[PDB]
Amino acid sequence: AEDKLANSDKLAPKLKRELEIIAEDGRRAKNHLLEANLRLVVSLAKRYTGRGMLFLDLIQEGNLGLIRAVEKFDYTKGYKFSTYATWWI
DNA sequence: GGCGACCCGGCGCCCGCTACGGAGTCAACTACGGGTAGGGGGTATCGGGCAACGCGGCACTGAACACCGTTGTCATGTGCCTTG
């Protein structure tokens, strides 16, 4: 939807708003996924705590890795998101 | 419903200096791609060492004059002897 909106060719206004709405719903689902995986990322932050970096800082950096991973994740892989994410985390 | 205790946090300090011990720390991986950094190779540019000239002090050139200084020199003046 956002790809089609990004193109310069003219689209109908109602169709453009529908595409924007679908992209917004995708954004909402993205944040749903991130909040779901917050627990995994804090677990992996535990896994590297106590090495001179504050635990919440490690959590935040892992969260950066998490947003990267979701930005690079899709169902085309026949695996759960948990297995794929942990590498990027 | 402001007083009221009380409660609680929250804070704030807690004589002076010397002099007086040591120390030192548990949890991935690899692939790429660039960029720099070093290496030697070679090259234009700057710096240090010798030959030709110029001075400069003095030095010789004494040669040619000068400065006293000396014994050359002397035509011309005292002293004794002979004659008016």
Q: How far is the CA of A11 from the C1' of B29 (A)?
A: 48
Resolution (A): 3.8
Q: How far is the CA of A45 from the C1' of B61 (A)?
A: 112
Residue A81 CB neighbour total at 10 angstroms: 17
Helix (H) or strand (E) holding A30: helix A13-46
Terminal-residue alpha carbon distance, chain A = 29
Q: Which of A78, A48, A73 is nearest to A61 (CA)?
A: A48
Q: What are φ and ψ of residue A31, in 5° steps?
A: -65, -35
Quickly tell me which residue has 């794929």 as its tokens: A84
List chain B nucleotides near protein: any atom < 7 Å from a Cβ. Answer: 26-28
- List residue ranges whose Cβ is under 7 angstroms from nucleic strand B: A 46-51, 87
